[PDB]
Every structure is written in structure tokens, then in C-alpha cells.
Amino acid sequence: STECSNLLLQYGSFCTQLKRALTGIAVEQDKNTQEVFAQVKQIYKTPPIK
Amino acid sequence: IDRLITGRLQSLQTYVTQQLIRAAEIRASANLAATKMSECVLGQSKRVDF
């Protein structure tokens, strides 16, 4: 809606702060999964003998 | 003026709440720094990848 989009600019940077917080959160789960799972440098393979 | 007071109170409450969450993160990092000076600097940690 154009009218609500015009009225939403009067509130300053509420949406920008919300987007910045959610983008930091989304970067944070990538950092979480990288620091949990990617502690190994080179990927090793199991030999066929078990 | 009540509209401006409510808006600025909401902005200050958002600022204080985000600073409280950020201060919790800084407090966790400071507890980690206290642990990493007690164990690393004031000792020798036997924990692997610590």
C-alpha cells in the first residue's frame, strides 16, 4: 500500500533497525553452524575397509 | 507533544533494550575473557581448541 508506505517513513528507522537486527541474526546462525561443524580444514573420506 | 513523548520513549526503550541485550552479549564475552585469562594467562588450559 502506498499510503501506509508513506506513513511508515514518519517513524524514522524502525524498519531499518529491525532489518539490521534480523540480518545480524541470519549472519549469526551461519557463524554458529560454521563454528560448530566446520572446525575441520580438509575433508577426509572413509576407506572401503570397515 | 504527547505523540512526540510516546515516540521518543519508544525509541529510548528500544535503545535501552538493545543495549541490555548487547550488554548481556558483552557480559558473556567478558566472562569468557575472565575464563581465558584465569585459564590461559593465569594457568594452562588442557581443554582442546581452547
Curated annotation (Swiss-Prot), chain B:
It comes from Severe acute respiratory syndrome coronavirus 2. This is Spike protein S2'. The chain holds residues 993 to 1042 of 1273 of the full protein. Subunit of the fusion protein that is processed upon entry into the host cell. Mediates fusion of the virion and cellular membranes by functioning as a class I viral fusion protein. Contains a viral fusion peptide that is unmasked after S2 cleavage. This cleavage can occur at the cell membrane by host TMPRSS2 or during endocytosis by host CSTL. In either case, this triggers an extensive and irreversible conformational change that leads to fusion of the viral envelope with the cellular cytoplasmic membrane, releasing viral genomic RNA into the host cell cytoplasm. It comes from the Viruses. The gene is S.
